[PDB]
Write a protein that binds this DNA or RNA. Structure first.
Lengths: 139, 353
RNA sequence: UUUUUUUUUUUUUUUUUUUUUUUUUUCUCCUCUUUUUUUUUUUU
């Protein structure tokens, strides 16, 4: 079933000590997609907050459009938003705790069309870094 | 030396009793041996007696520099030790597989429960902070060493009183009980251990077993659980194979028993504080039973210090003065000189060549 | 009117030891509104 992979990290402590901590990662076959046109209900069963298809389109910030422009994406006229967990992780590890707390309230709310997606826990959307890179380009 | 061996009549006797659910010293299954606390004169010193076991607890603090990292807390040593007098077998370096499990039980309980407030034991950060260091000794072994050691550590920590300091601007100062009054500590909760013994493959249990009952038992279960309703450690050991309803029954038992024990401890500490505040006499001395043959009291006594001058004078006067043969030092060459019968020649030379 | 024979509970005990609480992370962070700042005085 699951597929193990690794993630190295370079943590810098307050005393100036960095370390190559290594950690884990477990992929899965079926990440729920919380959509009303998922062509197989059972495999995930969509047990959460679920959109209703009326919109013309769907807009997904890549990472920055929710990092700073978040204050826009609250108007209850905006419809059809889905958040990729990698953007959430970027903003959490880059914008402290306040913006992230507003974002998580946004998500945990039955007034808007916000869901969250496990980009990084899905078996063919994950991609490993390569020779010569950066967080922006990989992102 | 070793301990007297165990016969095959005592095992039979304890097991027919245990099957019949009656013990030697009369106490039923879910009972403790009654307790008796006694306080020293300087703070953080007590003597607890559970049944016929004794433990001496004594807390003491001291000021050091706080390592590297964790710059805003203090450290808390512990060192259990087993005194040769507790029992014949205990020997300074031949019982190294009980000391470890005991120190561990004590440290995991006291330090992981987070009842002492080691937050507010700093003076500066990066600089001198108080380093407390608890110390317990076992005096008399009669079974259930860890319940008594835990109650002793609790009382000793809840009776200490630190020194106290003034800090303002960037300047230190250290007071004394006459310059400033010693200060108590802050104790969130009171984690108190309980032990259970299992007999003939878990079919029976007995609360608070002593040392003979300890040699006819399979394994031990200890359950440390602070006041309110919060468990803090458990450690099955020995030779036991346990069920799942039984752990819950044990947890109930430890809850009840720790309730009662905390009643007793609180009452004793309050009474002791009342005595210390009334203005009466306290201490190890005014604890000796007087209705008993092996205690005696005597107020002070000048013995007669009227004669010592005369005796000393006559002794000094009545003995032979130093004699007067003075010796001479001989000089060989700067660096070496000799005194005594001396040597014949100036120095040896070509003695064998 | 039915003789004779077919062993049994392992041998051993007179071995030295010079340590010591712990142990190993989590980031930057918008403090709202009459003011200069009042002040002697006396009854504790």
């Amino acid at each position: 079933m699951l597929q193990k992979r690794e993630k190295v990290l370079l943590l810098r402590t307050f005393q100036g000590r960095t370390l190559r901590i290594v950690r884990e990662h477990y992929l899965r076959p079926c990440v729920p997609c919380h959509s009303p046109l998922c062509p197989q209900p059972a495999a995930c069963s969509h047990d959460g907050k679920l959109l209703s298809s009326d919109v013309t389109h769907y807009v997904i910030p890549d990472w920055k459009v929710v990092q700073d422009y978040l204050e826009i994406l609250e108007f209850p006229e905006l419809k059809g938003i889905i958040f990729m967990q990698t953007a959430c992780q970027a903003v959490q590890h880059q914008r402290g705790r306040r913006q992230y707390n507003k974002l998580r309230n946004l998500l945990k709310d039955a007034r808007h069309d916000c869901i969250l997606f496990a980009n990084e826990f899905q078996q063919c959307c994950y991609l490993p870094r390569e020779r010569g890179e950066s967080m922006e380009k990989w992102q | 030396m070793k301990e007297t061996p165990l016969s095959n009549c005592e095992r039979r006797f304890l097991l027919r009793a245990i099957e019949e659910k009656k013990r030697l010293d009369g106490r039923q299954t879910y009972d403790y041996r009654n307790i008796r606390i006694s306080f020293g004169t300087d703070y953080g010193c007590c003597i607890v007696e559970l049944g016929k076991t004794r433990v001496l607890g004594q807390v003491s603090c001291e000021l050091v520099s706080p390592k590297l990292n964790r710059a805003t807390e203090g450290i808390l040593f512990f060192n259990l030790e087993l005194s040769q007098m507790a029992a014949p077998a205990f020997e300074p370096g031949r019982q190294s597989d009980l000391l470890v499990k005991l120190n561990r039980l004590m440290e995991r309980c006291l330090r992981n429960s987070k009842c002492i407030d080691t937050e507010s034991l700093c003076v500066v950060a990066g600089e001198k902070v108080w380093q407390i260091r608890v110390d317990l000794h076992l005096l008399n072994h009669d079974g259930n060493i860890i319940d008594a050691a835990s109650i002793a550590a609790i009382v000793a920590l809840c009776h200490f009183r630190r020194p106290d300091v003034s800090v303002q601007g960037d300047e230190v100062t250290l007071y004394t009980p006459e310059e400033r009054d010693p200060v108590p500590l802050s104790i969130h909760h009171m984690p108190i251990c309980v032990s259970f013994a299992f007999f003939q493959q878990g079919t029976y249990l007995l609360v608070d077993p002593n040392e003979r009952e300890e040699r006819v038992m399979d394994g031990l279960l200890v359950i440390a659980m602070n006041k309110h309703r919060e468990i803090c450690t458990i450690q099955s050991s020995g030779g036991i194979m346990l069920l799942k309803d039984q752990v819950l029954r044990c947890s109930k038992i430890a809850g009840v028993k720790v309730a009662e024990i905390t009643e007793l401890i609180l009452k004793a500490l309050e009474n002791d504080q009342k005595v210390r505040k009334e203005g009466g006499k306290f201490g190890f001395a005014e604890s000796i039973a007087n209705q008993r043959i092996t205690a005696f009291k005597m107020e002070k006594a000048p013995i007669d210090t009227s004669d010592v001058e005369e005796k000393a004078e006559e002794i000094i006067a009545e003995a032979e003065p130093p004699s007067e043969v003075v010796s001479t030092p001989v000089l060989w060459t700067p660096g070496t000189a000799q005194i005594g019968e001396g040597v014949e020649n100036s120095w040896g030379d070509l003695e064998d060549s």
